[PDB]
Design an enzyme around this catalytic site. Structure first.
Site, PDB file in Angstrom:
ATOM      1  N   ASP A   4      10.387  11.392   2.704  1.00 60.37           N
ATOM      2  CA  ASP A   4      10.654  10.305   3.592  1.00 60.37           C
ATOM      3  C   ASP A   4      10.253  10.618   5.167  1.00 60.37           C
ATOM      4  O   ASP A   4       9.642   9.527   5.592  1.00 60.37           O
ATOM      5  CB  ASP A   4      12.298  10.121   3.857  1.00 60.37           C
ATOM      6  CG  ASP A   4      12.936   8.892   3.062  1.00 60.37           C
ATOM      7  OD1 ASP A   4      12.447   8.519   2.054  1.00 60.37           O
ATOM      8  OD2 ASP A   4      13.963   8.673   3.337  1.00 60.37           O
ATOM      9  N   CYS A  13       0.521   2.271  -0.238  1.00 64.19           N
ATOM     10  CA  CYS A  13       1.827   2.722   0.183  1.00 64.19           C
ATOM     11  C   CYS A  13       2.535   1.555   0.790  1.00 64.19           C
ATOM     12  O   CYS A  13       2.432   0.562   0.517  1.00 64.19           O
ATOM     13  CB  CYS A  13       1.543   4.085   1.139  1.00 64.19           C
ATOM     14  SG  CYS A  13       0.212   3.716   2.486  1.00 64.19           S
ATOM     15  N   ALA A  58       1.922   0.435   4.533  1.00 72.30           N
ATOM     16  CA  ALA A  58       1.000  -0.198   5.149  1.00 72.30           C
ATOM     17  C   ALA A  58      -0.571   0.107   4.536  1.00 72.30           C
ATOM     18  O   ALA A  58      -1.238  -0.907   4.776  1.00 72.30           O
ATOM     19  CB  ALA A  58       0.796   0.598   6.533  1.00 72.30           C
ATOM     20  N   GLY A  59      -0.624   0.870   3.514  1.00 67.52           N
ATOM     21  CA  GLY A  59      -1.950   1.183   2.990  1.00 67.52           C
ATOM     22  C   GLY A  59      -3.116   2.059   3.860  1.00 67.52           C
ATOM     23  O   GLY A  59      -4.323   1.651   3.756  1.00 67.52           O
ATOM     24  N   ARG A  89      -0.832   7.736   3.496  1.00 67.46           N
ATOM     25  CA  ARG A  89      -0.833   8.292   2.287  1.00 67.46           C
ATOM     26  C   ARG A  89      -1.872   7.805   1.399  1.00 67.46           C
ATOM     27  O   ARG A  89      -2.673   8.584   0.750  1.00 67.46           O
ATOM     28  CB  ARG A  89       0.523   8.021   1.359  1.00 67.46           C
ATOM     29  CG  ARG A  89       1.621   8.628   2.133  1.00 67.46           C
ATOM     30  CD  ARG A  89       2.863   8.339   1.589  1.00 67.46           C
ATOM     31  NE  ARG A  89       4.218   8.330   2.468  1.00 67.46           N
ATOM     32  CZ  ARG A  89       5.538   8.120   2.248  1.00 67.46           C
ATOM     33  NH1 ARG A  89       5.674   7.342   0.880  1.00 67.46           N
ATOM     34  NH2 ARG A  89       6.715   8.143   2.884  1.00 67.46           N
ATOM     35  N   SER A  90      -2.174   6.614   1.575  1.00 66.61           N
ATOM     36  CA  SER A  90      -3.201   5.898   0.730  1.00 66.61           C
ATOM     37  C   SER A  90      -4.684   6.441   1.196  1.00 66.61           C
ATOM     38  O   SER A  90      -5.327   6.716   0.375  1.00 66.61           O
ATOM     39  CB  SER A  90      -3.381   4.350   0.971  1.00 66.61           C
ATOM     40  OG  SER A  90      -2.274   3.806   0.404  1.00 66.61           O
ATOM     41  N   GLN A 125      -2.550   8.605   9.239  1.00 73.25           N
ATOM     42  CA  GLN A 125      -1.885   8.217  10.680  1.00 73.25           C
ATOM     43  C   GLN A 125      -1.327   9.121  11.502  1.00 73.25           C
ATOM     44  O   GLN A 125      -0.846   8.720  12.325  1.00 73.25           O
ATOM     45  CB  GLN A 125      -0.445   7.436   9.873  1.00 73.25           C
ATOM     46  CG  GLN A 125      -0.950   6.042   9.264  1.00 73.25           C
ATOM     47  CD  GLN A 125       0.408   5.392   8.781  1.00 73.25           C
ATOM     48  OE1 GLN A 125       0.901   5.704   7.720  1.00 73.25           O
ATOM     49  NE2 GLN A 125       0.823   4.236   9.472  1.00 73.25           N
TER      50      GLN A 125
END
Ligand SMILES: O=C(O)c1csc(-c2cccs2)n1
Ligand SMILES: O=C(O)c1csc(-c2cccs2)n1
Ligand SMILES: O=C(O)c1csc(-c2cccs2)n1
Length: 284
Positions: A181, A215, A217-218, A221-222, A262
């Site tokens: 998380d 993910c 927001a894309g 992780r993406s 991010q």
């Protein structure tokens, strides 16, 4: 500089935040006018994450062709990816329309439906074989065929039917279920194992449309997923693997979608994943 020793030099000097801010300063800025039209407000999850006009995926629809999704086309590596936000209650039908129209084989999901006690995307696929989903706005039917639950990820076989033409296709759903998380994973080993499973399925290969990766927001992780994949492929293709510059690859990808990676922790994790992955590839 090489990667693994540039890495130790940033760790010892504690300058990850400064390196990451440099990337943010140099990143491309292109217009996203279609995303900001008033009629598209309920098609965007976050007001500050939008696809650029020049690289956005268009739906094959004359009323409203908009979806929050971008085509990342990597020329030297010969790989393409579609990066998109987690689907919203009013965009699940658009999401599967895109999968169909772009001829994708695989969908890569890097988030859980609920995280930190809040909803991060819609439940957009069926959870039981006998309870299929019908998307009436785009005339598609989606059926769960099988499910394989492992310790760090789950793979599902899905059938997508275009109800207009009665054509059917098999879609593979790769769901990484253990990203924490908060923060990033301590070791990249399970993320790399997951990446290799996506690769082995054919979902990233040129005989199919681009893989769809998301993910919430894309971009975070993406971005980590496609950055690690492309860097490892370049290290295999080039005569001199130590010439692969992860910061330069990231800035190239940010020509096609804003905000990829991010946090400085996600940047450090991407370096770690590429470094460990290059040892396993060989010829390892
Ligand atoms: O969260 C939602 O609203 C949702 C998830 S799946 C879905 C639909 C399936 C088939 C028609 S609408 N809606
Ligand atoms: O490492 C190499 O062999 C190398 C460095 S740059 C490069 C290419 C860029 C674009 C096409 S090939 N290859
Ligand atoms: O510069 C390096 O350490 C590096 C990165 S990948 C690589 C390879 C060696 C032999 C095959 S691939 N070397």
């Amino acid at each position: 500089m090489e990667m693994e020793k540039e890495f130790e030099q940033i760790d010892k000097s504690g300058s990850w935040a400064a390196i990451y801010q440099d990337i943010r300063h140099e990143a491309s800025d292109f217009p996203s006018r279609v995303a900001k039209l008033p009629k598209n407000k309920n098609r965007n999850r976050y007001r500050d994450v939008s696809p650029f006009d020049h690289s956005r995926i268009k739906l094959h629809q004359e009323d409203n062709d908009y979806i929050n999704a971008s085509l990342i086309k990597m020329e030297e590596a010969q790989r393409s990816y579609i990066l998109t936000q987690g689907p919203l209650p009013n965009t699940v039908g658009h999401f599967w329309e895109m999968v169909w129209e772009q001829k994708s084989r695989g969908v890569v999901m890097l988030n859980r439906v609920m995280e930190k006690g809040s909803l991060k995307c819609a439940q957009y696929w069926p959870q039981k074989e006998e309870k299929e989903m019908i998307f009436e706005d785009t005339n598609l039917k989606l059926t769960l065929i099988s499910e394989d639950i492992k310790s760090y990820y789950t793979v599902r076989q899905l059938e997508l039917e275009n109800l207009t033409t009665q054509e059917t296709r098999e879609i593979l759903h790769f769901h990484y279920t253990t990203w924490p998380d908060f923060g990033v994973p301590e070791s990249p080993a399970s993320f790399l194992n997951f990446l290799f499973k996506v690769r082995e399925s054919g979902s990233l290969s040129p005989e199919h449309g681009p893989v769809v990766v998301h993910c919430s927001a894309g971009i975070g992780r993406s971005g980590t997923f496609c950055l690690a994949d492309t860097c490892l492929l370049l290290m295999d293709k080039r005569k001199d693997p130590s010439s692969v510059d992860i910061k330069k690859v990231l800035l190239e990808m940010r020509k096609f979608r804003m905000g990829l990676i991010q946090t400085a922790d996600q940047l450090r994790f991407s370096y770690l994943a590429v470094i460990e992955g290059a040892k396993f590839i060989m010829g390892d």
